Ligand SMILES: C=C(CCC(=O)O)/N=C/c1c(COP(=O)(O)O)cnc(C)c1O
């Protein structure tokens with residue numbers, strides 16, 4: 001029995017990928033670049049296009065699909081809960097939202113969980129919490145709160161996010177901007193210490209590995225050292241684990257690699273296994289409780305459907321031991337790429353990452369990075385770079401041993417064929 | 423039926439009573455909402471049930487997110503069917519749903535370009551970005567000088583930039599420093615608008631056809647019609663927020679249709695998904711929308727195929743079930759009856775107001791405790807949540823049947839009269 005999208009789409013008589021591309025240019029706000037594929041279905045680490053070609057998905061929603069496409073447990077949890085109750089608002093109680101927050105609070109070790117919808121909203125929320133806490137508990141002067149963040153950060157596309165970006169296309173022509181941000185180099189403890197001299201600082205807002213910035217892995221101890229500096233000044237450490245969290249780097253949180261318990265933790269993306277948007281902000285009671293009744297809200301935040309989904313998605317990460325999976329396969333991946341590609345392929349600048357969050361930065365003055373992207377696709381690997389030159393390898397963590405060996409060999413083959421063609 | 427996971431995790435916690443749940447929420451959930459009166463376990467259509475099997479009519483409906491009713495079978499079927507196939511690709515890859523869904527909405531609402539985001543706040547943020555970038559690039563106003571006019575008591579969400587353009591104390595207090603670039607004028611005041619529009623740095627006027635969270639404030643006839651002519655006169659964009667008013671709630675497809683206004687930029691949300699998953703939209707002509715070039719905006723989940731499949735079903739339900747006609751007809755009956763039976767008899771009613779099935783009864787909180795009205799309503803089978811303490815809201819699913827609406831209207835009228843009896 002055809003649902004409305006199916007019947008409608010049928011009537012458009014779209015046969016080729018080009019037919020779909022034309023439909024984007026005509027009707028879809030054109031804020032994303034052209035795409036090389038029209039995906040129709042996904043299962044685990046694999047997707048298929050409209051012509052039945054199979055690929056490994058090496059983007060995975062930039063770590064939103066860690067549990068794989070269409071994970072049966074998560075889809076069942078979705079459909080069962082959807083037959084019962086999807087939305088009450090937080091104006092009314094329900095039998096799911098609190099149990100879901102207790103589940104998360106225990107899993108991550110926080111007193112209070114705020115559920116929002118997108119990663120941007122989690123960042124907005126955290127900044128609001130840190131500002132209000134700074135005014136109310138730190139007693140900094142009215143409208144003086146500052147938040148330190150890093151160059152090449154990414155946390156979203158709200159105006160306030162654009163206001164704290166150093167990426168030209170993120171901010172250009174979108175001002176005037178929200179004040180109150182101090183930008184410093186990533187991976188630079190000395191710069192953080194200098195900025196922490198300002199007593200009106202509320203928080204330092206950081207990624208454990210910069211995501212959209214290029215899979216920038218900081219030096220050993222960066223985050224550990226930053227937390228001590230912040231504690232010294234009674235400044236909150238807000239750690240954005242939207243992309244790095246949830247087993248992706250080989251630990252439950254990327255912050256775990258430094259034994260850092262964030263003062264405020266952000267999650268999103270794979271919190272729902274890519275099924276529906278749900279994000280979370282977690283913290284100790286004497287920070288989070290500054291959000292009194294009426295001072296924050298969201299129509300869909302903490303809706304029971306997304307809660308049911310998230311509990312199942314997080315349980316899958318545990319049950320399937322996906323952190324161990326990510327540690328093991330990712331160390332193998334980087335070891336194979338280094339052995340077969342360094343030396344042999346001179347236009348590779350770096351192979352880096354943790355767990356299954358991996359990147360290969362190329363030198364865009366020695367090669368066209370897009371040739372690498374297209375060659376990957378020809379070998380069945382779908383992959384989207386960041387900043388042009390940073391190739392990304394972010395597969396679902398459920399990828400099997402056999403599938404990962406196959407994908408690894410396809411990836412190596414692609415880089416070597418580009419070098420041969422150069 | 424076999425237990426669900428979440429039923430067994432929760433059954434593991436031994437939560438039996440509504441108070442066990444209230445405690446759980448107090449301990450683990452960020453405490454940014456008021457205490458709740460009820461623990462809902464199931465919804466179907468206009469009805470919800472608490473964990474004790476008590477039935478109520480849902481007269482909040484997600485503040486008009488559940489116009490198609492709780493658990494609409496078509497919408498749930500479309501969700502589950504698409505979810506078995508594909509949920510997310512990002513807009514970094516193509517898929518076989520997002521484009522067709524945007525074409526579907528483009529044709530339904532009469533726009534060149536559709537931008538899909540996730541929440542109403544994100545739709546507002548996106549619209550403000552589009553308008554500013556358009557002002558800089560097309561009107562060539564000076565850098566960082568773009569202004570946006572909004573109205574006192576507006577509500578568009580909870581981002582910092584939304585807090586920065588709010589006149590509601592709890593929405594902004596201690597969340598600054600604030601995003602600049604806003605001019606706040608009285609709602610429902612064409613003269614104030616005309617004056618604000620003299621400033622050539624204005625990019626847009628951003629307005630609700632009926633203020634939602636501000637208290638179901640219905641403007642005077644022709645307000646929006648007059649406001650658009652003023653903005654066009656000045657090449658200023660009219661951004662109309664229909665996240666709460668749109669989608670049949672006021673008796674027309676868009677509340678702007680009461681004034682025959684086609685917004686320069688339209689925002690939808692809430693019932694765009696029948697309350698099933700968060701999806702919002704921003705729609706506009708090509709020469710405005712196309713300022714958002716590749717890399718200049720984005721969203722992980724915006725336009726995901728699951729949400730698109732749900733939205734197309736949700737929008738089709740509105741048409742097939744003639745829910746605008748139903749809202750028009752039942753709404754008019756609701757306001758007629760409440761006025762006939764309550765005005766005069768109940769001196770602490772200030773006003774009964776609305777359009778379609780977006781209705782409010784503002785009470786005098788110096789003369790009555792408005793929470794007594796909320797509790798009495800609940801005792802009589804009606805779940806409602808006020809805005810601004812004193813503004814009672816009646817916002818049922820538009821699928822409420824003729825008999826259900828009769829029964830509910832009776833229970834509502836009964837509750838106001840019982841509160842007045844008790845005052846006496
Ligand atoms: C991959 C993305 C964006 C994808 C896209 O916009 O196509 N990352 C989003 C992100 C965000 C924003 O999340 P969103 O609003 O996209 O849910 C926050 N924090 C971190 C560390 C992030 O990496």
Ligand SMILES: C=C(CCC(=O)O)/N=C/c1c(COP(=O)(O)O)cnc(C)c1O
Pocket residue numbers: 089090091296297298299300484485541542543544546577578579580630634635663664665666667691692
């Ligand atoms: C009912 C609400 C908020 C409910 C809540 O936060 O509990 N309205 C949200 C809203 C919004 C924000 O939508 P949200 O971010 O909550 O999806 C935008 N525009 C209008 C006219 C709106 O009424």
